[PDB]
């Protein structure tokens, strides 16, 4: 209860899976909340789901689209005012290893996983900086951002970019004094309703060679790391990666 | 409010600095807490401050003494009834490099940082596993078991341990259904009493090349990230290293 | 002597600095080299200072253009027969923070030290795999794929992206009997003529605070590891990164 | 051939699996090798089978024996000259997770593995710095000092405190000037006569889920990452790890 008083926050891709529990607990923390999707049908439902609107709202916007990111803080803004915190949360995986990865899906995925949390970043620096916000950026950046794995390579690029991004932001933005916090956030597997629809994966990922703890996890294991980091709880973490993964990486 | 309700958690070193701000905040959250140190004139004027004896108290023990963890544990289920959270954060430090080490420095920060530690965690398991209790060992372990310094040798040496000797144990408690979970975490520099009695130690901390955003941090930072690896809210992280540094390590 | 035998070696961005080492520790070993520039004023003088055509030739060639690769390949494979080991040196930098990096830097800078590397180690697997070749594919990707810096945002976002892509494509590679190593090198700091030509760089580069060791290496500190890296001297590497930093990153 | 010409090497362990292979290739590069084991019917055989006496000699020695430390350097300079380079190798293990490691099964591992590692370190830094020597410290510290193992509790430990002990050692080693490296060598797991002997081990160990490449390495393997440590080849290498493990850590 109210660890998140007078946050305002963005969340890309929140009508669904990690995003919806992070706009939830968000919003039962005390944030007003924005989230987004590229389509419009599941973000309007998403967001009503959770709260009302003087709570949480609903911005179609692709995290590639450069021109719509500033359409969204501006959007954010007007509802609730300037905008503290950002999550981004959107991203695509290719089911490739490197070796096949058409150029097509590699672009494809660079924009939204590298170029959208770039986008987002540098606009969330530029608007959240020198406010007295205790602004912070979470970006989602994987265990796939800490080990490989053979038919991800793409998205591997894309979370090891991430990660250290991340820190190169969260630096200039220490050194410069501007009130604002840049770390990653990086789940192992989590259970979905998308998980539960491809057939075998959750057993896959639950096999002790892969999640030491023998079962996947849920959407608010992901949620409650992000209240942390977005509450002034954490005003001393910059810079660092924060996994919630099961024991994957452990071993 | 209520993040730790039901928990009964011994903090080892906890009636200073950090330990004392990880039990006033696990107290405040509903836990009971047991603080530990090697004397008593601190140890018992630490818990009053904090709260009434149903809330905390203090019991003395060296934590390299291995027999009397056992008492420690003994004296914790008597009071508050089945011990859930361990927080290993008694430690010292020697201010040598490897090659000025003596064999007795080694030996005796050893002795706090690296058996305590490990006289901790092995009894933990062994009293909080298949309980139910949604047990978490909480293991501190310094930006200093990812970095060297050349004037902490020892303490180096301790930390890299602690750390990855913390993994190990969460992966038998995690391929075991123990119920416990196992994490590190790693403060950069905190703003305390005995640092304050150091001439110039927090501006040398401060420098920005050392501690990017140009200031160290408070004990309550290293305290709110033990909160969240106590409470069950982390139930799916177990074996990875929490960092609170103030951008220390991501330079 | 000799530690190259037989092997048949592209390195791009082989005309000067620590890719012209490279290619004269390699040719020195008993590789074949073709060297690359995008220029070709530099590639051609390059090449003859480090011996003959039978040793070693230029190909000109900008990383970033994806049907010149399969044109580099072809070439060296009519010079030298067929393609072993591939080193991605290619690389630029951008001084800019992410705050300030415009969206035509970052598409630039990705496009050479994301997309090229992204290409030439797609193709080598491709060209390399299966053939008894004891192939290796060395990606290089800074101290800055480990630790941000506030100034090179876009730059810390390519490397952290190769670090990791590099141990998807390693795990690939093996899971499959192909016969290809990947890996990834790691510079600290290195003079080179440019490095000479940038007022301050050298001895801002050599404070304690930056490298411990006082000073920054040189090129043939990076041709070095590469030989060990392509020779099979490495066969059982893969996946790894290694780091030639003057203590850097220890701190 | 001559990449050690001059060189004068102590190797902990030196008479069995990594450590003889060491032993061998540092002969065959020019360096002269004084190897121990805590045995003597294993050391002198060791010694003959790879050279002569004034190329490699044997003396006993238990890394855990603080006062044998000096008697081992006394005899290698008398043997060869002073002292270049120093493999820490020696090591047990212990089949136990922390839950189970009793009092004395940690004091024996950490006596050898941490206390010897330790006490070698020291000792070479005061024999070797300041001599010219390019001198070079090798601490083996295993894909156990990344990674967790349930049953490896004690060990890991140990493997990560060395970890971190020569990244303290390296960097002050380097900031006074004292021409001593310090890293570390990460080996995954290795085919020996000793593995051989486990029923299973191997088979274990060369599963994809463990180790990617689908086999175990030779001890080879190990000795030509620590030639290129011990050679001036790495003369800006310091602090850092370096990891020959089939992929193991990678995923
Ligand atoms: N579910 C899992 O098992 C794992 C998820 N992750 C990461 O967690 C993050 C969130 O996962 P979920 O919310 O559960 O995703 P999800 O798998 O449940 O659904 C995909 C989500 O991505 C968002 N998205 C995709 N493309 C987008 C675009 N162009 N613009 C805006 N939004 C877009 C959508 O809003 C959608 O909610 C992702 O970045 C993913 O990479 C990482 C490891 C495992
Ligand atoms: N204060 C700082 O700047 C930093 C602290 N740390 C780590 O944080 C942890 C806690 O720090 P503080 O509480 O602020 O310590 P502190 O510096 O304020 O005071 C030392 C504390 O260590 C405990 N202690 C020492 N030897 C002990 C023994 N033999 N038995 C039981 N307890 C013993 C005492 O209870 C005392 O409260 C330590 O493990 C330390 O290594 C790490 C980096 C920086
Ligand atoms: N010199 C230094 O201090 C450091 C260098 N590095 C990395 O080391 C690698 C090699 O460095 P140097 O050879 O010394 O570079 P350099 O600084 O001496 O010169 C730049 C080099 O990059 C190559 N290059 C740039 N754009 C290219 C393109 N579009 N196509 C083909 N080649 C291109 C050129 O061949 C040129 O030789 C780079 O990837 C760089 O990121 C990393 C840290 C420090
Ligand atoms: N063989 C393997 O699969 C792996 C080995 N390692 C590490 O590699 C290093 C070397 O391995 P190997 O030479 O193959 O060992 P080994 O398994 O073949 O034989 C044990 C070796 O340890 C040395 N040793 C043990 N206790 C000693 C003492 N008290 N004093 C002096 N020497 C002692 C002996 O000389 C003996 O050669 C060890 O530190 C080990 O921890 C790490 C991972 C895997
Ligand atoms: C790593 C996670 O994002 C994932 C990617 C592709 C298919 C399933 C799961
Ligand atoms: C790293 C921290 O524990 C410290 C150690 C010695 C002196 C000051 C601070
Ligand atoms: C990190 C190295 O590549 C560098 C980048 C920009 C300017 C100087 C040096
Ligand atoms: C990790 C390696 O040193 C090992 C330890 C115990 C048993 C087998 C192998
Ligand atoms: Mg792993
Ligand atoms: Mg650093």
Redesign the pocket.
């Known amino acids: 209860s109210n660890r998140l008083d007078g946050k305002v926050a963005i969340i ?8 919806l529990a992070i706009a939830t607990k968000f919003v039962e923390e005390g944030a007003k909340v924005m989230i ?3 389509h419009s049908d599941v973000g309007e439902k998403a967001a009503k789901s959770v709260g009302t609107p003087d709570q949480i709202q609903f911005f179609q ?4 689209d450069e021109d719509g990111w500033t359409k969204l803080f501006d959007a954010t803004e007007k509802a609730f005012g300037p905008v503290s915190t950002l999550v981004n ?5 290719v089911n490739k290893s490197v070796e096949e990865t058409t150029t097509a899906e590699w672009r494809k995925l660079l924009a ?1 996983n590298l170029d959208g949390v770039f986008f987002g970043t540098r606009l969330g620096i530029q608007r959240m900086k020198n406010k007295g916000l205790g602004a912070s950026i979470i970006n ?1 950046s ?3 951002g800490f080990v490989g794995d053979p038919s991800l390579g793409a998205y591997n690029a894309s979370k090891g970019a991430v990660r250290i991004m991340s820190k190169s932001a969260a630096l200039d933005c220490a050194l410069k004094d501007y009130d604002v916090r840049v770390n990653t956030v990086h ?4 259970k ?1 309703p ?2 539960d629809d491809l057939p075998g994966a959750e057993e896959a990922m639950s096999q002790r060679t892969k999640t030491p703890m023998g079962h996947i996890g849920e ?1 608010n294991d992901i949620a409650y790391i992000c209240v942390y980091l977005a509450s002034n709880e954490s005003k001393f973490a910059t810079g660092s990666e924060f996994v919630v993964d099961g024991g994957y990486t452990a071993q």
Do not use: C, F, K, Q
């Not at 949360?89 to 995986?93: L, Q, R």
């Open positions: 890309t891709g929140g009508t669904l899976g990690i995003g987004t999707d590229r916007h692709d995290s590639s949360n959107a991203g695509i995986a939204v989602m994987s265990i796939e789940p192992g597997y989590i979905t998308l998980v959407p």
